[PDB]
C-alpha cells in the first residue's frame, strides 16, 4: 500500500501535491508534513500549497515541463521569504543549487534563516535590475524562475538570462497581468509579455493560466536560444 506516489515531474509527489522534505522535522510556512516509516526506512514529505505557490498551481494545472529536477542549478528571481524556493530546494536536492534573489531585506532575513538548514540555497539579497553587481556570485544556471509583476520585469529576467542562463537552458515565468497593466485585458498583457520574451530569444514552449488558484495569472515555460 503506497501512500505517496511519484508525480510525472521528478522530485514531485502526490499524497495533494508534496515534495520530499530536505530537512525532516521542520516546516517552512506552517505546511503539513507527512512522515512514513517502514522498518528502518523513513521519508518525510511537505505539502505544497497552490494558493501560495504559483509553481504548484501550474503543476496541478497540467504544465508539461518545469525543468526543476534533481541536480538542477536554479536562479530564482523574487524569492521573497522562500515559500516556493523551499520546494525547489527539495526537488533539486543536495546536488542541486538554488540562487534565491530577493530585493527586500526583511524578506531576505527569512531566506537566510531558511538557507541555514538547506545547504543548496544561496540567498542573494540584491536588486535583480542590476545583475552585474552580483554576477561574480552566480554560476551558470540550468533554469530561471521569476515572478513578473511590472512592465519592465520580463526585461529584467532577460538581462539575468543573458548573464546567467545556459544556452538551451529554460525559463518558468509567472505573470500577474493586473500588475503589468491593469488597463489592458489579461490576453493583451500575456501576448505582449510573450513578445518581449521572444525579442530576447526566450522562446515560449507552453503557457497556462492558474485558475482556480489565481485570477488572470499565467505561467510561461520556454527555452533560451541566444545567438552566437
Ligand atoms: C517578490 C519579488 C519579486 N521580484 C521579481 C523580480 C524580477 F524583476 F527579477 F522579475 C525581482 C523580485 C524581487 O526582488 N522580489
Residue numbers in the entry: 85 to 99, 105 to 317
Give sentences from the paper:
Fibrillarin (FBL) is an essential and evolutionarily highly conserved S-adenosyl methionine (SAM) dependent methyltransferase. It is the catalytic component of a multiprotein complex that facilitates 2′-O-methylation of ribosomal RNAs (rRNAs), a modification essential for accurate and efficient protein synthesis in eukaryotic cells. In the present study, we determined, to our knowledge, the first crystal structures of hFBL in ligand-free state, bound to the native cofactor SAM, and in complex with two fragments that can compete with SAM for binding to the cofactor site.
Fragment screening was carried out via both 19F NMR spectroscopy and X-ray crystallography using a library of 388 fluorinated compounds with great structural diversity. However, the robust crystallisation system we established for hFBL allowed us to apply exactly the same set of pools for crystallographic screening, and bound fragments were unambiguously identified from the electron density map. Compound 1 binds to the adenosine region of the hFBL cofactor binding site by an induced fit mechanism, which involves a significant rearrangement in the loop connecting the β4 strand and α5 helix. The movement of the side chain of V237, which forms a hydrophobic interaction with the adenine moiety of SAM in hFBLSAM, results in displacement of the side chain of Q242 from a buried to a solvent exposed position, and exposure of a new hydrophobic pocket (L166, A235, V237, I245, and V246) that accommodates the trifluoromethyl group of the compound. Compound 1 also forms hydrogen bonds with the side chain carboxylate of E191, the backbone nitrogen of F192, and a water molecule that interacts with the backbone nitrogen of A217 and the backbone carbonyl of E216. Our discovery of conformational dynamics and a hydrophobic cavity at the hFBL cofactor site will help to facilitate structure-guided design of hFBL inhibitors.
